[PDB]
Design a protein around this ligand. Structure first.
Ligand code: ZN
Length: 256
């Protein structure tokens, strides 16, 4: 699977039938059709820079993984009574600045998206087990709006030199991803999926109302990453965003 016509999102049906499911992500969020839920509590994050572990080029993207052996880095509140354990952050971007985000808001496409991923350690004993469970994952999505350079991205982009080609990995240490989060943690939530294969319908999405900035050149740094192995002809990662999928009668709640 990948993001080419050959093997891209419209092809994923073939090998992952769940692509045509009822809880697929991303979605377009229409703000006149969201329902304010008064039961939603604040989103609370408490992440430990010491849990930051590694950065990895996964061919279609790059992942920043976290030590998930204990509860030093957790998401709670919002729709949850279970505390959720940090394990990863990563981005999606598009071939152009116009569209790069996965989620859209009133049809507005953004330039890229940050996903910050957690698994349910209150109910399961590993990410592998939580991954396929309806209440397994909790993922904060942050829309990324082209404009001013985001210095908070610095360590991340600075790191990509060491993982230029597919399969390269590097230590990535002493980092707290909550520094990448917007000031206001007002959010929408809906039940959704992973946005690429295996595409499990295990994600409660937390989509931030407030975006964060990214410069056009910072984006070009993402696209500089190579999808090929060291030594092969260069194939840069031009894009890795899925089109938005039908809501199928789901409701997106607003905290605000
Ligand atoms: Zn993602």
């Amino acid at each position: 699977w990948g993001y080419d016509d050959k093997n891209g999102p419209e092809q994923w049906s073939k090998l992952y039938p769940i692509a045509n499911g009822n809880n697929q992500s991303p979605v377009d969020i229409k703000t006149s059709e969201t329902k304010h839920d008064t039961s939603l509590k604040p989103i609370s994050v408490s992440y430990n820079p010491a849990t930051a572990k590694e950065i990895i080029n996964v061919g279609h993207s790059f992942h920043v993984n976290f030590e998930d052996n204990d509860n030093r880095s957790v998401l709670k509140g919002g729709p949850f009574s279970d505390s959720y354990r940090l394990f990863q952050f990563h981005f999606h971007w598009g071939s152009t600045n116009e569209h790069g985000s996965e989620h859209t808001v009133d049809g507005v496409k953004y330039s890229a998206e940050l996903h910050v991923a957690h698994w349910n350690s209150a109910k399961y004993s590993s990410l592998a087990e939580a991954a396929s469970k309806a209440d397994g994952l909790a993922v904060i999505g942050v829309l990324m709006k082209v404009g001013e350079a985001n210095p908070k991205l610095q360590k991340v982009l600075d790191a990509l030199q060491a993982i230029k080609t597919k399969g390269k990995r590097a230590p990535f240490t002493n980092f707290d991803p909550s520094t990448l989060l917007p000031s206001s943690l007002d959010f929408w939530t809906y039940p959704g999926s992973l946005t690429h294969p295996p595409l499990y319908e295990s994600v409660t999405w937390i989509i931030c109302k407030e975006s964060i900035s990214v410069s056009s050149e910072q984006l070009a740094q993402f696209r500089s990453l190579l999808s090929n192995v060291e030594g092969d002809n260069a194939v840069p990662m031009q894009h890795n965003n899925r089109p938005t999928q039908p809501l199928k009668g789901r409701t997106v709640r607003a905290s605000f």
